[PDB]
Amino acid sequence: HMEKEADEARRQIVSNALISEIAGIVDFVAEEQITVIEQGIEKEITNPLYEQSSGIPYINRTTNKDLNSTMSTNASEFINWGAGTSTRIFFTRKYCISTGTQGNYEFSKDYIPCEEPAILSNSDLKIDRIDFVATDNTVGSAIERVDFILTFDKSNANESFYFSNYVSSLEKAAEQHSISFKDIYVVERNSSGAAGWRLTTISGKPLTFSGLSKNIGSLDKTKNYGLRLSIDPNLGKFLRADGRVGADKLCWNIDNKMSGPCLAADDSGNNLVLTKGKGAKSNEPGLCWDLNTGTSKLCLTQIEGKDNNDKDASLIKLKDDNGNPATMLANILVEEKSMTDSTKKELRTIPNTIYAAFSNSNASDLVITNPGNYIGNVTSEKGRIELNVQDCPVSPDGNKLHPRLSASIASIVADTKDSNGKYQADFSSLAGNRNSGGQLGYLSGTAIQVNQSGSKWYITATMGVFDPLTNTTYVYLNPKFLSVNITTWCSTEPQT
């Protein structure tokens, strides 16, 4: 428990460094064509590994296709690695230093860092040698397997077989890079030379790490041991029909070139991000729908914009191929700071507008005979405007939406009884509001009230009118010669 966070945790940092080196090398091997910088620009060339005119160390291959067969003892076959060797130069960018190394490739990205991790300079477990197992005997052959020989530098007299504690951390560190060990074998030598490495055997049978524990007693403790980690460069190299291999990105082709848009994940785990293709003349990435029935496709496209303060920003535009805005059918909520309290944010929907007049025609319905004493029953008054309360759409969790309704005056006249006792003014249809009329009184105004039950809106109104011809004051209820524009919406701001 004490040493499990000191000893066991420190070796994890070592395993992280080792696996990052391994993953980079394996990535390099798996790129048949690589991107380099030549004239200050990117260029695709054949990986020097697979150019028959390449030299050391790129053409170096071992021929031990069988995991149990003898490991190479020839420095022109295996690749010596670490201190004393210049090998890293050939797998790192030429301009890792400003003047340029003796390496002849300026890789557009680093497969492994320029500098070997400092932690791996002092550690008892280092990569001592790499074997690129050739698929065939041709110069620049494809590579069927990559073996990493890890030397264990025991800083103790005893405890020769004490590298088994690194294996667990190596396995989960490999899982973090989406690679796995095809096999792990115990190796040995009795010298400082990389050519001396050979498979450890028990009664002639090469010893896998799996068999180590039970066969540990019958092994020479003076000798120097190591691990050979085998990696299949083609495992997890290609996207699969079954979806079991992740994509770093996916880009689409146009006219047989990878010049279309790309999708990649951001660091959140939630987001896929669309960016423009290399062949785009404008920077306006779009996700589009097409029916393929003779009409335009529709695209949600990112375009440049400016915010409140005139600073660079962007927005999305829903458009056809002519560039005209297109239609989305949806419920919209708009979030906005409240105009009285800048610390509070409110949500609202798109309103609807409804034109309507109240609907009392007769004097007996219109005239409130006992005003002041009269108490209005808005649920059951004649001439009222009544509407069903709307259903509000889905809202984010901390935000209850309330149905809302307001009424604004559209037309209003102080109508009075004509010689036949009838009221001629009528605003029931907006196209004909001026058609009917005659003598008018003096307007005192109108009180328009809106009330709500569970499922109904009730809009009512009184109007005060003075008739100078008969010298009498009138109070009218829900008159046809008063019309309103009714606005309906939903909001976090409640109805008053």
* 168-177: Cβ within 8 A, 24+ apart: 169/8, 169/11, 169/12, 169/14, 169/15, 170/15, 170/18, 170/19, 170/229, 173/12, 173/15, 173/16, 173/18, 173/19, 174/19, 174/22, 176/16, 176/19, 177/19, 177/20, 177/22, 177/23
Tell me: do 295 and 363 sit in the same domain.
no
Tell me the CA distances in angstroms from 325 to 34, 301, 304, 321, one per residue in order: 42, 11, 16, 10
CA distance 348 to 435: 38
Tell me: do 326 and 363 sit in the same domain.
no
| Secondary structure of residue 430 in the 3-state scheme | helix
Residue linked to tokens 């798109």: 350
Residue where a domain terminates, one of 331, 354, 381: 331
Tell me: do 100 and 195 sit in the same domain.
yes
Residue of 72, 80, 78, 43 lying closest to 59 (CA atoms): 78
CA distance 135 to 46: 18
Alpha-helical runs (H) found in 395-451? none
Alpha-helical runs (H) found in 298-439? 363-366
Tell me: do 417 and 278 sit in the same domain.
no
Q: Is 377 exposed, middle or buried (0-12, 13-18, 19+ CB in 10 A)?
A: exposed
The resolution, in angstroms to one decimal, equals 2.0
> Residue 313 is inside which H or E element, if any?
strand 312-319
Contact 416, 475 (CB under 8 A): no
The H helix count followed by the E strand count for the chain is 4, 25
CA distance 209 to 229: 10
Tell me: do 72 and 205 sit in the same domain.
yes
> Residue 155 is inside which H or E element, if any?
none
Tell me: do 433 and 455 sit in the same domain.
yes
Residue 482 lies in domain: 332-496
CA distance 493 to 204: 84
Residue of 398, 407, 393, 394 lying closest to 451 (CA atoms): 407
CA distance 305 to 261: 21
Residue where a domain terminates, one of 246, 270, 304: 246
Tell me: do 119 and 260 sit in the same domain.
no
CA atoms within 13 A on the CB side of 215: 15
Burial per residue of 341-357, b for 16 or more beta-carbon CB atoms within 10 angstroms, e otherwise: eeeeeebbbeeeeeebb
Tell me: do 161 and 214 sit in the same domain.
yes
Residue of 92, 81, 90, 85 lying closest to 115 (CA atoms): 92
Contact 175, 156 (CB under 8 A): no
CA distance 474 to 415: 10
Tell me: do 120 and 216 sit in the same domain.
yes
Tell me: do 135 and 229 sit in the same domain.
yes
Residue where a domain terminates, one of 246, 271, 299: 246
Tell me the CA distances in angstroms from 282 to 275, 277, 278, 477, one per residue in order: 12, 10, 10, 63
Tell me: do 60 and 175 sit in the same domain.
yes
For residue 367, the 8-state DSSP code is B
Q: How many domains does the chain have?
A: 3
Query: Tokens at residue 378, please?
Result: 């808005």
Query: Phi-psi category of 439—alpha, beta or left, where left has phi over 0 and alpha has psi -120 to 50?
Result: beta
Q: What angle do CA 304, 309, 313 make, to 5 degrees?
A: 20
Query: Phi-psi category of 9—alpha, beta or left, where left has phi over 0 and alpha has psi -120 to 50?
Result: alpha
Tell me the CA distances in angstroms from 441 to 56, 82, 278, one per residue in order: 109, 105, 75
E strands of 320-413, at which residues?
334-337, 345-348, 352-357, 385-388, 402-412
Tell me: do 415 and 433 sit in the same domain.
yes
CA distance 265 to 242: 19
Mutual angle of helices 165-175 and 7-30, in 10-degree steps: 50
Tell me the CA distances in angstroms from 243 to 89, 176, 240, one per residue in order: 37, 18, 5
> Residue 324 is inside which H or E element, if any?
none
